[PDB]
Symmetry: C6
């Protein structure tokens, strides 16, 4: 239901932030 | 319902973070 | 209600991330 | 109530993202 | 319980965004 | 249950933002 859907969107948000962290690491080197 | 509306705004947030990741990749790769 | 208030703050968060994406595009040079 | 507390933290998050957008605008140079 | 735990993680998120704002200000010189 | 799962994803989000702050600190030095 809707609470699982919320947890799944937060998982997608964490995944995009992981990608941002990786790109910033690239910029840092 | 309001819980679906919350899930939809989180989807929009994930979409903007994807765009930010792409722009950071652009900055990283000139 | 409080659930609508939560959805509205998430909308404001999505709006600020959109602005950040645009500024990063500017930094990237377009 | 706990739901109001959640909305208030999301408001603080939107405020920090606004500050980040402003700093990025400074870096962008407009 | 779980709703207080959610508010507390959002507080930690606001704190990390404050740190990011500070680092960006440093980069901005 | 689902509310704990939401708190756990927010914890993962705070962790990724901490990593982003750390990479930006690296770039700042």
């Amino acid at each position: 239901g809707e609470l699982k859907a919320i947890a799944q969107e937060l998982k997608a948000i964490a995944k995009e932030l992981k990608a941002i962290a990786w790109e910033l690491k690239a910029i840092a080197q």
